[PDB]
């Protein structure tokens, strides 16, 4: 299976700074159809996975602005321009290239108390 | 508005069996592909099985720590997914999400908020 890492696997913050998260793939994501299915997902504490980011830089529905994803073939990185509460929670990179589906082990966003 | 929604969980002994439904809405279920991932500290969020749509003729797909143990179905008319697990081990507790993508779509874009599988013969 396709090897999906992350880093760092806390980062601490303060509201309003700046965040950036690292995933990396065993191989490249870079479907046969051209495409790079490599998504970015958050999830707080006692709830489920929300999608935020789809093929490397799209951002999903109701998903905001100050997100954003950037990236190719083996390595990527999801940015956000000034943390907010309401995004605090574990980050989790997937790839969908290749099958099975796998999943980074995740980057807790939390706050620097 | 996609609706996902998980039960079924509870607490097991290590080698039984457990049946989990998931009820959905909001979405073209019948050409759906639908998904069963779980989530636990030792090994995080991992892909468990798929089935496929009738195009497909609802083929399946397992992780191969599931194989052999693991059933998933569906109900199309009921939009149902459904996840059997026989001969449960410690290793399969987690919580256990349905969620799902479609062929030129191949991402989970919705997920339920869990159910909770506990496989353990003490405290
Ligand atoms: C629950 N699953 C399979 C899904 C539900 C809704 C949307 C999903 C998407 S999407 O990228 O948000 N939608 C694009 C086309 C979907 C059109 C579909 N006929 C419908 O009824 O909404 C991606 C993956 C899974 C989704």
């Known amino acids: 299976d396709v090897v999906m890492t992350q880093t760092p696997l806390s980062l601490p913050v303060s509201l309003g700074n700046q965040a950036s998260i690292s995933c990396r793939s065993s191989?490249?994501?870079?479907?046969?159809?051209?495409?790079?299915?490599l998504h970015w997902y958050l999830q707080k504490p006692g709830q489920s996975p929300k999608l935020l980011i789809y093929?490397?830089?799209n951002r999903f529905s109701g998903v905001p602005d100050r997100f954003s994803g950037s990236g190719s073939g083996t390595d990527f990185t999801l940015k956000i321009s000034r943390v907010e509460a309401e995004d605090l929670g574990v980050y989790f990179c997937?790839?969908?290239?290749?099958?099975?589906?796998?999943f980074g082990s995740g980057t807790k966003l939390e706050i620097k108390r | 508005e996609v609706k996902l929604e998980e039960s079924g969980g509870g607490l097991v002994q290590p080698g039984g069996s457990m049946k989990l439904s998931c009820a959905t809405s909001?979405?073209?279920?019948?050409?759906?592909?639908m998904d069963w991932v779980r989530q636990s500290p030792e090994k995080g969020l991992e892909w468990v099985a798929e089935?496929?749509?009738?195009?497909?003729?609802?083929?399946?797909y397992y992780a191969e720590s599931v194989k052999g143990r693991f059933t998933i179905s569906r109900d199309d008319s009921k939009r149902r997914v459904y996840l059997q697990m026989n001969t449960l081990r410690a290793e399969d507790t987690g919580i256990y999400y349905c969620?799902?993508?479609?062929?030129?779509?191949?991402?989970?874009?919705?997920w339920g908020q869990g159910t909770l599988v506990t496989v353990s013969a003490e405290p």
């Open positions: 969620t799902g993508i479609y062929y030129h779509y191949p991402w989970f874009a919705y």
């Open positions: 191989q490249s994501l870079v479907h046969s159809n051209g495409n790079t299915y």
């Open positions: 089935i496929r749509n009738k195009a497909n003729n609802h083929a399946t």
């Open positions: 997937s790839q969908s290239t290749h099958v099975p589906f796998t």
């Open positions: 909001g979405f073209t279920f019948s050409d759906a592909w």
């Open positions: 093929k490397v830089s």
